[PDB]
Amino acid sequence: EFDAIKIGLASPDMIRSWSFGEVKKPETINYRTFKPERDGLFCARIFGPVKDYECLCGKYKRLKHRGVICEKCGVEVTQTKVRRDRMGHIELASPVAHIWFLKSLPSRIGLLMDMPLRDIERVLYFEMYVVTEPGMTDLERGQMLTEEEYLDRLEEWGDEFTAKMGAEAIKDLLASMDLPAEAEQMREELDTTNSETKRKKLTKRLKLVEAFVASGNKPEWMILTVLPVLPPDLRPLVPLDGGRFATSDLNDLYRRVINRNNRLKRLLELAAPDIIVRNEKRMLQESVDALLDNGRRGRAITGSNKRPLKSLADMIKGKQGRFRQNLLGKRVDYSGRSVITVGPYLRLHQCGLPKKMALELFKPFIYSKLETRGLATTIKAAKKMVEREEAVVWDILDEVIREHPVLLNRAPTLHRLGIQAFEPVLIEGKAIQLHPLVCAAYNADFDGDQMAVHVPLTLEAQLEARTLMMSTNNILSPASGDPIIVPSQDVVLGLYYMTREKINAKGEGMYLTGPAEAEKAYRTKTAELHARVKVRITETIKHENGKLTTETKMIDTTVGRAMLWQIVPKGLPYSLVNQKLGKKQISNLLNEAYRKLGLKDTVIFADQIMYTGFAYAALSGVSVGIDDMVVPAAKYTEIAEAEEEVREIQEQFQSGLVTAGERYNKVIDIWASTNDRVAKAMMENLSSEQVINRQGEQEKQESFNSIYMMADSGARGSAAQIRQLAGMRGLMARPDGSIIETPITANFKEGLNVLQYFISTHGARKGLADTALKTANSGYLTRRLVDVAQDVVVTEHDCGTLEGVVMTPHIEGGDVKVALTELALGRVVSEDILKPGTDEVLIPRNTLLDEKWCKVINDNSVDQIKVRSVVTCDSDFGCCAQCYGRDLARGHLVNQGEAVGVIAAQSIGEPGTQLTIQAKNNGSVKLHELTIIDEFGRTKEKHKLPYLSKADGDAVAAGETVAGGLPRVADLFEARKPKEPAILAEHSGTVSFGKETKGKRRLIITRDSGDTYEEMIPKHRQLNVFEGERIERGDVIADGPESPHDILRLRGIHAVTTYIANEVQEVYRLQGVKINDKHIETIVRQMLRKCTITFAGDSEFLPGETVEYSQVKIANRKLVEEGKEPARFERELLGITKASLATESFISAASFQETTRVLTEAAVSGKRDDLRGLKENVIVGRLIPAGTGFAYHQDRQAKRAQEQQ
Amino acid sequence: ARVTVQDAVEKIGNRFDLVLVAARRARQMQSGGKDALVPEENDKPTVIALREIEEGLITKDVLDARERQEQQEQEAAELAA
DNA sequence: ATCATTTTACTAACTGATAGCGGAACTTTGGGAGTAAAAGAGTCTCCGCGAAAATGGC
DNA sequence: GCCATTTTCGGCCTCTGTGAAAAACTCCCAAAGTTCCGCTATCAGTTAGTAAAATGAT
Ligand SMILES: [Mg+2]
Ligand SMILES: [Zn+2]
């Protein structure tokens, strides 16, 4: 229907064209008949009838008279919904300035007229004059005159000049302006200007003037003469129960405006004294400003609630505004909500749904099937049968929901795994039954949690739920690629208990034919689950090439391990099950099953694992008791020793040998050491036991303590919590953060006293409050990331670019932090991976690096590779499939139309709640910094080189001595400037001292061409440079935090990308959160979307102008094809908020935040919204250009071009 | 009945294109009079279309081909009138 | 295949009622003008927020 | 180039009416509103009558 949204200024003729009449009276409804009043805010002659196909008279009261205007009233006989579309207008007695174009900084009227806002307000506030036509007088246009001065020059010259007050003066000045003449004069002045501030001022004014000329808008339209009036049904006055009426504040504001306008007209009819007329005009201006934007001009007008009235700007803007409350998010039909329970019998794609709840949700389908089979003749009969709840209705409901997917969603939806598709199963109850394995996906526990359900209606939606959103497809985490359906708690505990080993168990040493005989022995009470036996295992390996090799051999194992192998699918080794299975082992089993067998086998294996774990956790009988918490006997001795030497050092303090701070420090140190010793003793006492073996001797066995088993299996608990239960609680902090000297020397088994409990509450309250605030911080950060990256969609397959980023193992000392395999998993090779010291192409170009090639690289021992990245992509809009790589949630190359930006933003923002020189290897030494490289050719040590035992290339043996998170991520993504940034070498040359100017110092640098560049530096700076040294570009002069803008300007795109990725990943890896770097590079690419033009060239770009990089790239390509001088640009780094607000589309910018500024800029410029992103299509209700809509949108674009031909 | 839409995405390659093709086939079988090429086995049109795609009987090529065929046949029939 | 009769299709008339429209008169409501000692500067309370960025002023 | 005052932002679900004060009569006139009566259009109910078609008997 429509392809673009055009915004701009509204002319009075256009406003009259919109309006269906003029509102002349502030009347709303009669107080007796409750009927609209003529020429009022609710007039039926202007806005439409209040009853369908009726008139206020009642003479025309049926449909035969449609479109006929009653002669007695004037009300057109039509539908009432026209009252939601029909507009009105008010003919204002005097012009009023638009508040948005006057007080939204920068003031557009002041910018256009080159006058300060204060002077314009003084003219508007009726204080001092302004000259409109100077005439044949020394007076100049736009200069300000006091009343006394006005009288003097009026007695002097008389009618030769015209000087006015108010918005009439501003409109008579704006209309007298010649935009082309001003543009030419300011172009000439900018050509012969030198000052930078003046350059900025007139370049802004020139941009505004050229925008006005290009858009076709007139400046005088910024002063309102005709005021449009909203449809009554959008500002309704409707009766409540009990005779009360509910009204909108817009009615009060409109009534005020109409009353003041009518009073002004009456005063002008009476030939009023001037002062009263000026007061009335001020009141009219104030009323119009309050109606448009209340509180911006001055004191906000309040009603009878002592609370400010809500205006149109408040109605369209804010968190509670239309954009965020009704356009980007809506309340929907065919939805429900219920508490969630656990269904251990369900399959991974099944969810338990109440029968009544499904009956209410699927009611139209039940009607359709009740008529199709002839059980109900008409829809009323079907409704009656559904209401009476007959058995055939239940059968119809069962047939309806058979293969109909349903959507389950839990708030908050941090990532896309928070909404999934399941097959409903009717259950007797009122609570939704949920599969346990999806709980980690939902972050849901059964302590009162509620989940919402949605019913996809169309066939397309059902197939989308079945194919994309089904739980069986979403078993890999899109943030990392690791499995997300890993077992936890009871399943892990059962698999751990069954796979444990016991010494001298019943049935030890027996020989079993296989898992079936092991199960038979277990059920017959012949052998225990933990008896060491020898089992004949038939084991099949599916190799990388697809070879299926079956080997039958006898393996030493336990009965439980074979019984668990009974459910392991074919194609996996027995070594995965021939061990005690914690959370890590089961996760590895599931990952191997996915990587070697597929998805269906993985789903069945996960279901069987959950069933077996639940069953054998039930059969285990694991229980927590007061005897399971064994406090070590060494704890009391250690406490006594610590207290004694505390007494000794207190005596030392009374002697003056040490200060109070040293005493505090060593008391804290000893208390930490004693806590560590007590924890070690308790862990040793809890982890082991002595048993009698077959020979009769005493053997060492791992303990079967319930708490120890819970902690070791990884189901629930850790070493720290066991330490608090059976050891020491440790030192705690004061509310400010300082650590109390005396720690809690008691655990929870013995019990704390009053003081220790109070100290514990000190930190518990801090933790709870920190969680509460960090949740909101993470939500805001995620929203900003989504709004900055929502436009990134995979649009092509290959962009044909040779650029890429270099990838090496991440080294932070003598050990590797992350391997090259982890970073290269799923990336496309940019240049061929040659074998070290050889010219053989091991891995060719444009090949995805999967597990096989990762193993190949690890075996070959390749150190540095180059891969394609989203930041270096050449795609005009979005990115291409190859530059992105494997999609972590699916395992293959990313498909066309994937909204990778939203996935990246969600992946980064979801863990926000969790967020708060001696050589050690044998090899050679290489200098660039200090690097130690092994004999295989891998760099295994990286260390800094402050300004040595071995020289470059000298072999070094082992042991030789050569000699806070979430705010950090927020500032990193916002490109925040550090308070004390590091001074960086702007240009390459030799350093030279200069005049030590008072206040702060100056320095100079001599380039290769002899040009001297001056640098301004503060006094308090520990300089690293020395005179006579040629410092390279990007060398550090003053140490400190590095500004990302400086890194981008002086090092390049790759350097800033690496810096941001490394810092964000350091913050995340400190907490143990695994997030792929392509997400952070999809955010960094969005940051680097603007360029400032340095060389204008012949393209339509001005120097000092910030424009989009893609447009400049296309313009440069066109100019090169035309053989004309191309443009030169300097890429700019913007934060996520500024990049979000600097988008080409104004709908998305207005929907994000600061609607007033965005709308004002779009209106003055006359911007056009092409609806190319997700948010615009969501707001206008069209298909998003991502996924299943992608092809659709593509088709339209083709037709566009084909028609434009 | 069917679960785990793997074979279909292997035959098609792209999940979204598969969704669109299956939606077209299901609309043909439900709104139109077209019959299934596989035993129904008490399955909804979406499941039948997915099974047909898995068996290789239905692709985008086939659908567009037979749609153009129906337009040609209808044009010839209207000429015959 | 043909005749005679009942039912069908079509006019007229009377009964009785009911709703709608128009005119006369009365009560109810609604808008407007007037009030002559003199009276001749407002509120109106609050203000328990912090951090970062974008505009004037020098 | 640097203060100094504005400007705008601050997670997702579910229930969940509010506010409450505050100061005129008096007279005159025209228009809307209520009620009543008369005229007229329209219809449901019933009967009678006449001419013709359907139909059964022979
Ligand atoms: Mg909970
Ligand atoms: Zn009317």
Ligand SMILES: [Zn+2]
């Ligand atoms: Zn690319």
